[PDB]
Design an enzyme around this catalytic site. Structure first.
Site, PDB file in Angstrom:
ATOM      1  N   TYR A 166      40.885  36.021  46.444  1.00 27.04           N
ATOM      2  CA  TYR A 166      39.929  37.055  46.824  1.00 27.04           C
ATOM      3  C   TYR A 166      40.312  38.538  46.816  1.00 27.04           C
ATOM      4  O   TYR A 166      39.450  39.374  46.979  1.00 27.04           O
ATOM      5  CB  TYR A 166      39.333  36.698  48.204  1.00 27.04           C
ATOM      6  N   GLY A 175      40.971  41.956  45.210  1.00 30.93           N
ATOM      7  CA  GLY A 175      40.599  42.505  43.913  1.00 30.93           C
ATOM      8  C   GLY A 175      39.154  42.105  43.754  1.00 30.93           C
ATOM      9  O   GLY A 175      38.582  41.602  44.705  1.00 30.93           O
ATOM     10  N   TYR A 176      38.554  42.319  42.591  1.00 34.22           N
ATOM     11  CA  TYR A 176      37.150  41.957  42.404  1.00 34.22           C
ATOM     12  C   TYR A 176      36.802  40.508  42.744  1.00 34.22           C
ATOM     13  O   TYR A 176      37.604  39.595  42.568  1.00 34.22           O
ATOM     14  CB  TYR A 176      36.708  42.200  40.963  1.00 34.22           C
ATOM     15  N   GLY A 177      35.558  40.329  43.178  1.00 37.94           N
ATOM     16  CA  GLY A 177      35.025  39.026  43.533  1.00 37.94           C
ATOM     17  C   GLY A 177      36.003  37.938  43.944  1.00 37.94           C
ATOM     18  O   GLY A 177      36.957  38.175  44.668  1.00 37.94           O
ATOM     19  N   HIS A 196      36.949  41.215  53.963  1.00 39.63           N
ATOM     20  CA  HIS A 196      36.592  42.546  53.489  1.00 39.63           C
ATOM     21  C   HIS A 196      35.479  42.504  52.437  1.00 39.63           C
ATOM     22  O   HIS A 196      34.560  43.329  52.464  1.00 39.63           O
ATOM     23  CB  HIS A 196      37.833  43.267  52.945  1.00 39.63           C
ATOM     24  N   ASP A 197      35.553  41.540  51.521  1.00 42.97           N
ATOM     25  CA  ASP A 197      34.545  41.371  50.471  1.00 42.97           C
ATOM     26  C   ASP A 197      33.184  41.155  51.087  1.00 42.97           C
ATOM     27  O   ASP A 197      32.179  41.708  50.659  1.00 42.97           O
ATOM     28  CB  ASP A 197      34.839  40.136  49.633  1.00 42.97           C
ATOM     29  N   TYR A 236      31.775  44.300  52.769  1.00 45.09           N
ATOM     30  CA  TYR A 236      31.189  45.213  51.802  1.00 45.09           C
ATOM     31  C   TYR A 236      29.814  44.722  51.416  1.00 45.09           C
ATOM     32  O   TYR A 236      28.893  45.509  51.219  1.00 45.09           O
ATOM     33  CB  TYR A 236      32.089  45.333  50.573  1.00 45.09           C
ATOM     34  N   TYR A 238      33.182  58.360  54.496  1.00 46.16           N
ATOM     35  CA  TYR A 238      33.079  58.379  55.953  1.00 46.16           C
ATOM     36  C   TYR A 238      34.134  59.310  56.529  1.00 46.16           C
ATOM     37  O   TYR A 238      34.858  59.965  55.789  1.00 46.16           O
ATOM     38  CB  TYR A 238      33.214  56.961  56.531  1.00 46.16           C
ATOM     39  N   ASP A 276      36.946  48.734  56.067  1.00 48.58           N
ATOM     40  CA  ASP A 276      38.196  49.190  55.465  1.00 48.58           C
ATOM     41  C   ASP A 276      39.390  49.220  56.434  1.00 48.58           C
ATOM     42  O   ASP A 276      40.493  48.804  56.060  1.00 48.58           O
ATOM     43  CB  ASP A 276      38.012  50.576  54.843  1.00 48.58           C
TER      44      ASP A 276
HETATM   45  O1  LIG Z   1      29.822  43.516  42.260  1.00 49.33           O
HETATM   46  C1  LIG Z   1      30.674  43.269  43.450  1.00 49.33           C
HETATM   47  C2  LIG Z   1      31.564  41.920  43.448  1.00 49.33           C
HETATM   48  O2  LIG Z   1      32.642  42.377  44.324  1.00 49.33           O
HETATM   49  C3  LIG Z   1      33.491  41.371  44.885  1.00 49.33           C
HETATM   50  O3  LIG Z   1      34.538  41.980  45.577  1.00 49.33           O
HETATM   51  C4  LIG Z   1      32.660  40.554  45.826  1.00 49.33           C
HETATM   52  O4  LIG Z   1      31.950  41.462  46.654  1.00 49.33           O
HETATM   53  C5  LIG Z   1      31.659  39.777  44.980  1.00 49.33           C
HETATM   54  O5  LIG Z   1      30.831  39.002  45.851  1.00 49.33           O
HETATM   55  C6  LIG Z   1      30.773  40.786  44.186  1.00 49.33           C
HETATM   56  O6  LIG Z   1      29.980  40.088  43.253  1.00 49.33           O
HETATM   57  O1  LIG Z   2      31.227  45.565  39.965  1.00 54.52           O
HETATM   58  C1  LIG Z   2      31.330  46.975  40.135  1.00 54.52           C
HETATM   59  C2  LIG Z   2      32.262  47.385  41.288  1.00 54.52           C
HETATM   60  O2  LIG Z   2      33.469  46.546  41.229  1.00 54.52           O
HETATM   61  C3  LIG Z   2      34.526  47.043  42.073  1.00 54.52           C
HETATM   62  O3  LIG Z   2      35.584  46.136  42.101  1.00 54.52           O
HETATM   63  C4  LIG Z   2      34.997  48.373  41.527  1.00 54.52           C
HETATM   64  O4  LIG Z   2      35.517  48.565  40.545  1.00 54.52           O
HETATM   65  C5  LIG Z   2      33.902  49.338  41.812  1.00 54.52           C
HETATM   66  O5  LIG Z   2      34.261  50.635  41.332  1.00 54.52           O
HETATM   67  C6  LIG Z   2      32.590  48.892  41.151  1.00 54.52           C
HETATM   68  O6  LIG Z   2      31.516  49.597  41.757  1.00 54.52           O
HETATM   69 NA    NA Z   3      26.753  43.831  42.064  1.00 55.77          NA
HETATM   70 NA    NA Z   4      37.326  40.254  46.116  1.00 58.67          NA
END
Ligand SMILES: OC[C@H]1O[C@@H](O)[C@@H](O)[C@@H](O)[C@@H]1O
Ligand SMILES: OC[C@H]1O[C@@H](O)[C@@H](O)[C@@H](O)[C@@H]1O
Ligand code: NA
Ligand code: NA
Ligand SMILES: [Cl-]
Ligand SMILES: [Cl-]
Lengths: 118, 118
Positions: free
Chosen positions: B26, B28-30, B46-47, B50, B66, B92
């Site tokens: 988890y 980093g992205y998604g 944290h995910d 957000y 903020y 955060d």
């Molecule tokens: O587009 C944002 C992408 O970010 C990840 O960190 C999670 O929040 C996922 O659930 C989400 O799909």
């Molecule tokens: O999915 C888009 C979303 O993904 C995150 O992980 C970042 O990179 C953000 O800058 C972006 O808004």
């Molecule tokens: Na999205």
């Molecule tokens: Na993530």
């Protein structure tokens, strides 16, 4: 990577990425609910694509740099061998093209906290 | 916003944001699957935080600026009135402190495409 996606967005369309920073229930970060429209569905799909990109070894959607060319408005993904690069460039190209062809309903900007995305 | 989160990360801990860019299922992205450890668990929460921030009017977790102060290693969220600001700063700060207190298992860097995140 994200910087490449941004450039792809204005390569294929009229609107740039900032236009899709806060749209519908899925454009921008995360999201929930039912995509409100075509554009939002574009974002919905891209999100899942990125999340699937993780299932590839050494593949992080936001930082992986791939090979692509823009011959405005045409985007071409060059990778064949580097599967992570190729998969992610496809996610981004698909989204960029989807954004360009989809209508932009100003009525759907700023609705994520409304009953729409519930 | 994200730049603030990155600075909170080094405010509260010894490792910077880049060491989390590709950790577990988890960070980093998604992501998907079960968070492999405490740190991954930090990222998982944290995910979701957000995700919820989006349920707030005019609230985008990645660009929302903020108010906060850093008195290394202490982080303080100043917002009270601006609900979006206060919520996001909390997400955060919580993550930043969680990262700092959790062990970092190098064994868990680069596992997102392995059975672990299945
Ligand atoms: O587009 C944002 C992408 O970010 C990840 O960190 C999670 O929040 C996922 O659930 C989400 O799909
Ligand atoms: O999915 C888009 C979303 O993904 C995150 O992980 C970042 O990179 C953000 O800058 C972006 O808004
Ligand atoms: Na999205
Ligand atoms: Na993530
Ligand atoms: Cl190739
Ligand atoms: Cl205040």
């Amino acid at each position: 990577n994200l910087k490449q996606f941004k450039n792809m967005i204005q390569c294929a369309g009229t609107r740039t990425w900032t236009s899709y920073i806060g749209y519908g229930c899925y454009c921008g970060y995360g999201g929930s609910g039912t995509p409100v429209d075509e554009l939002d569905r574009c974002c919905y799909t891209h999100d899942h694509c990125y999340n699937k990109a993780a299932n590839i070894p050494g593949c992080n959607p936001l930082i992986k740099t791939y090979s692509y060319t823009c011959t405005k408005p045409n985007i071409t993904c060059n990778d064949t061998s580097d599967s992570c690069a190729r998969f992610i460039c496809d996610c981004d190209r698909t989204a960029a093209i989807c954004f360009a062809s989809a209508p932009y309903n100003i009525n759907n900007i700023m609705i994520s906290a409304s009953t729409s995305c519930q």
